Amino acid sequence: LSRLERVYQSEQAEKLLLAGVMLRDPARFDLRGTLTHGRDVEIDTNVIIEGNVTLGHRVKIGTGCVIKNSVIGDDCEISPYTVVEDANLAAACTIGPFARLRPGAELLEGAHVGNFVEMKKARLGKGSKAGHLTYLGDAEIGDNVNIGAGTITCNYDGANKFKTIIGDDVFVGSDTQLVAPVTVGKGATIAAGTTVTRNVGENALAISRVPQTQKEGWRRPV
Amino acid sequence: LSRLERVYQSEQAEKLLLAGVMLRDPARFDLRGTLTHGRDVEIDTNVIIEGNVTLGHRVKIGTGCVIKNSVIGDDCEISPYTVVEDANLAAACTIGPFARLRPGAELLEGAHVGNFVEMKKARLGKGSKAGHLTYLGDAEIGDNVNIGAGTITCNYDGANKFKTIIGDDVFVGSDTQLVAPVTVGKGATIAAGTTVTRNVGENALAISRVPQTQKEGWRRPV
Amino acid sequence: LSRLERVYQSEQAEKLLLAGVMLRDPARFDLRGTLTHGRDVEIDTNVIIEGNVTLGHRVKIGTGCVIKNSVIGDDCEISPYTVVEDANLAAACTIGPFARLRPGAELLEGAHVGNFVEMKKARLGKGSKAGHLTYLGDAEIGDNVNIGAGTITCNYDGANKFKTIIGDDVFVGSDTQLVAPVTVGKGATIAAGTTVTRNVGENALAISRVPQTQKEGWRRPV
Numbered sequence A, B, C: 001l002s003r004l005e006r007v008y009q010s011e012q013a014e015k016l017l018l019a020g021v022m023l024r025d026p027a028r029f030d031l032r033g034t035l036t037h038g039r040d041v042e043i044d045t046n047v048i049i050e051g052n053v054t055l056g057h058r059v060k061i062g063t064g065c066v067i068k069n070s071v072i073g074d075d076c077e078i079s080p081y082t083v084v085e086d087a088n089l090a091a092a093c094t095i096g097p098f099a100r101l102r103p104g105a106e107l108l109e110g111a112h113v114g115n116f117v118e119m120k121k122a123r124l125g126k127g128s129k130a131g132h133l134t135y136l137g138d139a140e141i142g143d144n145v146n147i148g149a150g151t152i153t154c155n156y157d158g159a160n161k162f163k164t165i166i167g168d169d170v171f172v173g174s175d176t177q178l179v180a181p182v183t184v185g186k187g188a189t190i191a192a193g194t195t196v197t198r199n200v201g202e203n204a205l206a207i208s209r210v211p212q213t214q215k216e217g218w219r220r221p222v
């Protein structure tokens, strides 16, 4: 079985080259299902396409990516070592390297997802960004929102999962915990480090911060 | 040396196929040491097995994984781009993608380790979960424990390393800092965002949270 | 184009072997630009070298790494699935696995960067460590500094980027948020979980922590 199915991977790689896809190495490509694509698609080494996948025009997929049952709009750039499962990307999204989209990730036009970021059942609005070290689960995020490094939707209480809704034009400071269910109004700002347990008004700053203090001459243990 | 040792990798890949291992691509497989395996093992592209490794039955290892000196029980699923070194997994553990187990990681039956999670000298009990963006070092974690996204054992003070002990049936809220040495009693709940500096009683909620407030009409700088 | 340029990758791999580089698999190596190297360099599977790259002696590069326009000093160890772009590493740095250095990352002698750590326009001093789940952007970090898991430079306010400066001999507790622009004096200690909004004095402990409390007999929802 193994050698035979490996041969069928060469066939596919070859047919893809003939149909105008740029494969960096046809010997390091795997298609387990069906791929539909537009023009000028570029696929790097060690990519694996699973299930039923569709790529628009000029999509670029970097080394090591795994894309399963997903829809990827024109001009998207998927950077190295990014895993995508049952997600939809609109045109001109940039994700990765080291991004992980679980089923139900919906990215709107121009959205950005950076390194060590995970999405599941979450929509990221147009031009919105989640650049670092973040989990967004069971969330609606509006357009032109900035999701600071370290932000986490607390969506699961051990019994049920609950929905977070963030409005347009929101700035989420780093290391914010969004305790679901919670809604953050359009234009609001969440201070870095905030534990958000209550709805935030439009154009409001939400904060839950102890003033910084200092003790002089502190010796660490030797 | 290089071409010769590459040939010896083909030999191994071939012998593994003959012995009933399912290798997705024998040309993208590396065994640097010895592998013992049960029946129905499936190994994807670009896996590297190092040192002395043993896999039970029906173990599935996804693309890009690196497994060194480890013991992996029956039915485990190791997802893509996961690195495992000197770890033991009981039956039916699921780890990755992008998990990183350092020496001394001990996972008990059915345990789960998600993306961007690191373990070192830490035991994860039966059916317990650490799904996201977490470091567990020098820790004992009991059975049926949930470790929320963003949790970190503070195990090292710049001089020494100290042990964290979490009991059975504990819910660790997201972004908890466990300041070692510390013990959290069976059934307890740690509120999201808590800095745990003192032992937590059985069935207790521990919390260290400033009430959320809000200022109206907050303008961000242009 | 594809098959022809693939052939030129074999040529390069072959020339590199002749020039004394240890390539684990010449069929899984890609050079897109120019590589200069010293003696005893070891390069594992699925590495991609981009732009103009220089490696000192005895550099070891693990599986899946992507290195572009970078300078890597003698004795460095780059662990698996690490992405490096426009960075300089001094001698004896260890980075990865799963590290991500963006342009302007400058690592001084013996520095360490661990899993799920991102640097951009940031200097890491001699013997300094950032082992886990951290973003350092637009930062100066001195020598013999420990950057705890979960630390984040808050460098961007939605309008501008600002600089964080950490002195020599500083201990940054886990999950610290550094709100830029901010300076932390030589020898200081930041308590785990602190939101640093004000400059920290030399040899001072900075802290912003609510005392832990506990409520007895807390039932989670069923």
Ligand SMILES: COc1cc(OC)c(S(=O)(=O)N2c3ccccc3C[C@H]2C)cc1NC(C)=O
Residues within 6 Å of the ligand: A148, A149, A171, A172, A173, A174, A189, A190, A191, A192, A205, B220, B221, C154, C155, C156, C157, C158, C162, C179, C180, C181
């Ligand atoms: C420098 O970047 C920041 C500064 C800052 O306050 C000075 C805050 S904040 O959240 O404390 N905050 C914010 C956030 C955005 C704009 C202005 C301010 C003032 C203040 C209330 C956040 C960041 N950046 C990130 C990514 O968190």
Ligand SMILES: COc1cc(OC)c(S(=O)(=O)N2c3ccccc3C[C@H]2C)cc1NC(C)=O
Residues within 6 Å of the ligand: A154, A155, A156, A157, A158, A162, A179, A180, A181, B148, B149, B171, B172, B173, B174, B189, B190, B191, B192, B205, C220, C221
């Ligand atoms: C919705 O998910 C959560 C809710 C929640 O409080 C309403 C808390 S909590 O930690 O603030 N907390 C918890 C945690 C579990 C169950 C019930 C409560 C009430 C409260 C004291 C935590 C989460 N989830 C995660 C992963 O952190």
Ligand SMILES: COc1cc(OC)c(S(=O)(=O)N2c3ccccc3C[C@H]2C)cc1NC(C)=O
Residues within 6 Å of the ligand: A220, A221, B154, B155, B156, B157, B158, B162, B179, B180, B181, C148, C149, C171, C172, C173, C174, C189, C190, C191, C192, C205
């Ligand atoms: C056990 O490791 C720690 C202990 C600790 O306090 C007991 C603190 S702390 O930041 O709360 N803190 C520190 C930090 C370093 C040395 C001594 C102390 C005492 C106290 C003020 C931090 C860590 N480790 C990490 C990685 O954060």
